Amino acid sequence: SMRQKMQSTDQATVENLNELRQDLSKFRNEI
Amino acid sequence: IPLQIVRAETELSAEEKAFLNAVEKGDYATVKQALQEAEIYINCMDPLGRSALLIAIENENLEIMELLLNHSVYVGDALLYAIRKEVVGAVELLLSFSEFTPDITPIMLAAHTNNYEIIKLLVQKRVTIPRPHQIRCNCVECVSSSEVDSLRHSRSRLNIYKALASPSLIALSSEDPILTAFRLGWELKELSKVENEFKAEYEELSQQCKLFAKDLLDQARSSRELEIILNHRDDLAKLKVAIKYHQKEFVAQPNCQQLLATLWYDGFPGWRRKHWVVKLLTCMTIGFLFPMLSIAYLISPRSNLGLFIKKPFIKFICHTASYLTFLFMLLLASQHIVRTDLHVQGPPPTVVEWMILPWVLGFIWGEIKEMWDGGFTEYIHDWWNLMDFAMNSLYLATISLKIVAYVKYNGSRPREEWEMWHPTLIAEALFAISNILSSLRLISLFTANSHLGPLQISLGRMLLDILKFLFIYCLVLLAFANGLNQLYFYYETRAIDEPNNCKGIRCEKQNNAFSTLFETLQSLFWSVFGLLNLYVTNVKARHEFTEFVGATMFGTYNVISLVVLLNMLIAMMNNSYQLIADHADIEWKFARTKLWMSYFDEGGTLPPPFNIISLIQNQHYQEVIRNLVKRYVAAMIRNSKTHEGLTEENFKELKQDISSF
Amino acid sequence: DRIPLQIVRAETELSAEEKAFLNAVEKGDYATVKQALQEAEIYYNINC
Amino acid sequence: APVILAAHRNNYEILTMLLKQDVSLPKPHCTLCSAKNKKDSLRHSRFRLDIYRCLASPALIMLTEEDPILRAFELSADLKE
Ligand SMILES: CC(C)CCC[C@@H](C)[C@H]1CC[C@H]2[C@@H]3CC=C4C[C@@H](OC(=O)CCC(=O)O)CC[C@]4(C)[C@H]3CC[C@]12C
Ligand SMILES: [Ca+2]
């Protein structure tokens, strides 16, 4: 119950997706 | 102290380690690998307890969920979790430690979430919600459930009532959403008193229902739609139903108030445009001619003058003028010019009393008609009506006692020789009390003014706490009165032994103040206003201990009464007024609407001296309701949807088109 | 002992082709919308 | 101690992992403590408050105590004094 109390905006879900995207982009040019 | 990990979680196996990791990532090649692993063998759960299906639902990958269903994993409560997550696609796909209580159904959860699209989807399948029993139901099942498990019973009832009060569900499934909102709000308000444990939840639900009804009314775009809504009968029937259910915000809507104003001010176009001096002159000249208008209506009810008094504002002015004339005639009775002699035991009525008699009969007949027509229950709600009943009863008692005194006594006698319980004295006292009660009724006319109305309402709402304070003060007063009377009752002295034959504290030399309980209560009452002298605690026998104890008790009573309680009351009244001031406008408008509607009817046209002498309308209503609901749904969607939609379209569009390129 | 729930005011539902066109418009695929509109012109709805 | 700072943040995942290895925490109050207070009283007071803030962590009580309801009752009366 407590997790839903503060984890509701879910900004760190789309932000985590953006972080995966940036890691993939950095790998691309680096390789 | 080092302590230990008393509570832990079962470790994940190698297969469990491999699984839910690709599921969190969601790569479809890893999904093919998971399918291959399943063929090699899926139901493993994360430490949160969510299986593969639930976390796949969270990932919002419909293909993954479809593949999981093909593998025939345990569905469990996946539908409820999808409804809670409020994702339409997963709910549609599913249609094609337990988190929730066992009584929860998908439709109840959807109504709890108040999602219009999901509720529309589920209600297409024709789901049902169990109906609740009465608030005071005493049957076999209710008693068995309450005795076996009361907490679960209360929780189930609260869940059902919370599901039934969803604005989206009411809009979709109710034939008359406004009436349903009214009835549900009233019923939920009544349930809060019986179920004291869940008072806040029921109050919140009732407030939500009221707000939904008001916001549904707020979407009218023409006067024709407003008339159709307000005049619907299952004459302003809907307005009367709203008044009956205490829908203050619904009544105080500006458009409804404008319609009521144009109904009330009939015959006076552009009344607001006129300067206030012109308004005052018009009111005075209209109220001056009340007898002529009353007679004209009595003779020719359908002529111009006859129709003049049928308008609500003119009728109100005439009634006010008649009451003011009655009060002015009451003021002339106390003038000594009326009373020729004061030594007649049984006197005949004077001229002023003869003039006052028709008004008294008129008021009694009006109150009888009001009570009989409205019924006993409606009559007591006013509170003001109680005053009317008391005044009329006192007037009747005065008349009866006057007749008895006239019949019985037939001779002149000095007034100082009359006994204590002479009928004339009782009649005079009752008449004076009746005059006091009659003069205080003019406060009820303050609600018609925009300046003195809200103040009168606010002062009315502040009289509830003063009584609660007075109860505690009464306890304190009784305690101290008992103590003082117990101390001082031995030294009671007779009236002969005192100067001028006084006993009590209504004399220049106060005496015997604490000799009886009644006199002690009166003496302690008058000390609040400082009208009791300090020498009343003295004893003729001059005993020092008794006088010291009495003075100490009197001082303690004075300190407690005047230093603590009065300041506490001042602070409490300060706090209460600030909260009341916020909602003064709505309450005043509700009160003025109640006052106005009493003059719309044709029953009480004449003032007190002179009184004693279906399918087509339903089709139109359903058309208007259809338009209002459609506008309301779009407006509430706007606040919820635009920001979320824009944000989702940005990143999602960015992360797939680039991959395709 | 139960409350039946049913839609009282019913509105005509869109066709499958119109819903697919709506989803294509929402998904922002210009090629799919162009093909759908060309097929609509061939068969003789954007006004839906 | 790293565990003390972890309990200050009041979250479950790292607290469970860190406590998996055996970890002790000295209890707070003698003659020896009086000697330390003479040398540095500001540091002594700060350390005691640091420990009690770690002990009053909802995540730590749930994971380490057998009767979390009774532990919250006794600690609350302890901290008020
Ligand atoms: C105070 C004592 C000395 C009694 C003598 C005064 C009366 C003649 C006054 C006192 C209060 C008056 C009433 C106060 C307010 C109103 C509402 C008023 O309604 C409006 O026209 C309101 C217009 C607006 O909204 O501004 C009509 C007169 C009336 C009944 C007044 C009628 C005359 C009353 C009874
Ligand atoms: Ca009345």
Ligand SMILES: [Zn+2]
């Ligand atoms: Zn029952």
